[PDB]
Design a protein around this ligand. Sequence first.
Ligand SMILES: CN(C)C(=O)c1ccc(-n2nc(C(F)(F)F)c3c2CCCC3)cc1
Ligand SMILES: N[C@@H](CCC(=O)O)C(=O)O
Ligand SMILES: N[C@@H](CCC(=O)O)C(=O)O
Ligand SMILES: [Zn+2]
Ligand SMILES: [Zn+2]
Lengths: 260, 259
Amino acid sequence: NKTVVVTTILESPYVMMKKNHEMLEGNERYEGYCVDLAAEIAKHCGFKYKLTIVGDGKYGARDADTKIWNGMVGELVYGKADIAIAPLTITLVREEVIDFSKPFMSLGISIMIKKGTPIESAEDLSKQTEIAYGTLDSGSTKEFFRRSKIAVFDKMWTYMRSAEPSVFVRTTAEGVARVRKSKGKYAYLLESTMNEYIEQRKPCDTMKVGGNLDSKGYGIATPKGSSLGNAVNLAVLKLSEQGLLDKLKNKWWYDKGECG
Amino acid sequence: NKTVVVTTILESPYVMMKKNHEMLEGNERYEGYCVDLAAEIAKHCGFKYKLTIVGDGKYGARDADTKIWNGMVGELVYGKADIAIAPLTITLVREEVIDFSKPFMSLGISIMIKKGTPIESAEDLSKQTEIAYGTLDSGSTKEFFRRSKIAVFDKMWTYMRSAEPSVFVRTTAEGVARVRKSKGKYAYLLESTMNEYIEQRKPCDTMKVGGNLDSKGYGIATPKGSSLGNAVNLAVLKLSEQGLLDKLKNKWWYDKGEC
Ligand SMILES: CN(C)C(=O)c1ccc(-n2nc(C(F)(F)F)c3c2CCCC3)cc1
Ligand SMILES: N[C@@H](CCC(=O)O)C(=O)O
Ligand SMILES: N[C@@H](CCC(=O)O)C(=O)O
Ligand SMILES: [Zn+2]
Ligand SMILES: [Zn+2]
């Protein structure tokens, strides 16, 4: 019996510091969808756990030169954490080095605009220069554009990779702030889950436009061959079938909506 | 090196007989989304394969008395097939006896009505008596209602399990025909994928109403511990990331929609 080290990331509404966090200790400092999910997974799998925030604040990508993984993925690969419970996208390159449970949430890449921005689609962004657009660094959305052979997305990447000043951001919060402050001149490409959450938070000045660009899932990740992988997978399916995942999504997205 | 036996099911538009199937042979007799997907999975994983239609025409459930698995799940469990490539729902009870890849398609349980039926939600169905409703008699949708602790769905199951004559059907096609012939007095609970497909088929007299009741996925299934599982999983993720799954959905659902 060992305390499971959980790596996660501060990303609303998945993991957030409670208002009164400075007077709280350990796991009690945090709240959110992944905090609730971690508690459920641990209960069903019968383990005790410690939530830790990923040191470098990243999801995980592999450096092309050194081949070293960063982010939550790196924490699993190098044995610094036992499990990642976060909005971590299931991708081919990651599945090669870590294990993922069946998905607990669906999502797709989507477009965030400041309200009133005359953009309705990815096609619309790709055909103009007035409105800058970019993505998060070290995540699956950037890799999507880097790899896409779809004409519109390829054009978009050609623009984004060489754009000056840089259109990429270190955190989702930075991307959102950039939209809010840029008077309609920056659009942000981010996962529909995060986009839909921010759309329902004050100051209610952003919106999701167009359909999703792809369709994928977040999964709970463990190091390759971990003893926990099997149980975690079954727990995710149990929570899905009990309706708990739906309950948590309602709790953290729409029950907490502040744009009416 | 051995030919992989693929179990699948005749379910439109996943697997269908080609119009000229009697003058074709082997895998060439069939067409559809899962036929296209099987060819791709096989190419990427480097195996030869034979498509076979599940003998009993069922998805897979375990008999409460005999504890024997039927349908495509049974074919995997008892060693008759090496892989199932079909609209087979990932469920906990199945994942305990077979392996699933990461999902290749997302779906949820949904409501099919004859156009004009005064029903907009599961809540609506549960409150009234005039319009009967049911599910495929063997499958994950029936098990969803059987197991649900959610009040609306519990109410629906309490009605369905006791309705006479039976509100359950043997095939999706039977459920669809029942909606079409019942003048608005039967609604059919089925997966959103199959609902959305039929919505685009002549005579264009059905529609999907309300939100989905759950959210889940179909996966490619292999017998527990099979050597093929890892490669199949990586192939699904590659095909997802390359846009192929989206292309195949558009091909079989919308590009040739008749409405
Ligand atoms: C809990 N819910 C929402 C789900 O079970 C679910 C079902 C399917 C998916 N995802 N996941 C993936 C992936 F594994 F790639 F992430 C894909 C799908 C649907 C479209 C193809 C690829 C995500 C969640
Ligand atoms: N969920 C993403 C991070 C967010 C994004 O890239 O848009 C990942 O796992 O990399
Ligand atoms: N996809 C379902 C069958 C259809 C249904 O139950 O609605 C299964 O795998 O059992
Ligand atoms: Zn629970
Ligand atoms: Zn480097």
